[PDB]
Amino acid sequence: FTSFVLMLLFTGIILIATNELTYNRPREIQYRYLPRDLDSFIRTQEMPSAIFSSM
């Protein structure tokens, strides 16, 4: 009787250790500097055309 639940937990905890890898799901995006000429062009321009963007 006791050995049954002991083996049940024995396999179940290995199953849990396998399961746990799925939890963390972060997004990866990198940052890079503008080209110098393009940066100067963007800084110089006076009107923005489209108003705003959130991404």
Binding site: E46, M47, P48
Partner: protein, 48 residues
Amino acid sequence: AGGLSQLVAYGAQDVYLTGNPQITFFKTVYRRYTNFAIESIQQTINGS
């Protein structure tokens, strides 16, 4: 009638002016600038 009567009158010539807008006139973006202050200071004159 009113300004809208002109606004809607899109024509062939506009392919060069308002098709695919790159700027607007109605929202200025101001650029932040280096912090500074300015003052008038008298310098010493050497000589008569």
